[PDB]
Structure 1
Amino acid sequence: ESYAIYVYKVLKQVHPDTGISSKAMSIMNSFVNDVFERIAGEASRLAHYNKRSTITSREIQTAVRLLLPGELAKHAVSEGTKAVTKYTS
């Protein structure tokens, strides 16, 4: 499987009047999997450091701030905060 359907949804939402290529979709899926893996590995490291048995939103935020650059990390943190708020709402 892959996140192709979700990537296509995001693409139609950001630019409803454009397309993509097969190699482009594959590169996007590879990027999604790689970002997921990096964040998950960083979260596992932080959880092992804190001696916790559950990855939390705080752990994910720390992992994001450790991986992504400054402005991009701040924007991602804001998006995740809004998302978790709407979820808990």
Structure 2
Amino acid sequence: SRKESYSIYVYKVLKQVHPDTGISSKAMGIMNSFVNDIFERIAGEASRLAHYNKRSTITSREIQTAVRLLLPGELAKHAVSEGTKAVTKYTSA
């Protein structure tokens, strides 16, 4: 029925990364399940942090420290830098 998916977004990301490379539907489902699992993990960790810190709202610092905690140092630093650059790009204009 009305079952949404992220196949088109993954296709566009692949095109912007590899202009002449494809992928299989089974790999598409694998990526969808990976995204779902990581999303669930991040949502749970954000929920626990918010419940500890008594925050009624979510800001960028929460997800920043979440990235610092889950991913290792180099990957966490790169992801934090990318997200901060995106936030600055949106906010500046």
Q: Shorter-chain-normalised TM-score: which range?
A: over 0.9
Deviation at 1:55, TM superposition (A): 1.2
TM-score, normalised relative to structure 1: 0.93
Q: CA RMSD in A?
A: 1.0
> CA offsets, 1:15-73, max 9 Å, x none?
01100000111111111122221111111111111100111100011111111122111
**SS of 2:80 mapped into structure 1:** helix
Mapped pair 1:85 → 2:88:
yes
Number of aligned residue pairs: 89
Check whether the contact 1:39–1:63 (CA below 8 A) recurs between aligned residues: yes
**SS of 1:54 mapped into structure 2:** coil
TM-score, normalised relative to structure 2: 0.89
Which structure's CA Rg is the greater one?
Answer: 2
Considering Cα pairs closer than 8 Å and 6+ residues apart, tell me whether 1 or 2 has the greater RCO.
1
Give the distance between the partners of 1:79 and 1:85, measured in 2 at CA: 10
Give the distance between the partners of 1:26 and 1:88, measured in 2 at CA: 34
Give the distance between the partners of 2:40 and 2:67, measured in 1 at CA: 12
Deviation at 1:11, TM superposition (A): 0.6
Runs of 4+ in 1 over 3 A off after TM superposition: none
Give the distance between the partners of 1:86 and 1:55, measured in 2 at CA: 20
- Find the partner of 2:51 among 48, 52, 71: 48
Check whether the contact 1:44–1:55 (CA below 8 A) recurs between aligned residues: no
Unaligned runs of 5+ in 1: none
Q: What percentage of residue pairs aligned between the two structures are identical?
A: 97
Unaligned runs of 5+ in 2: none
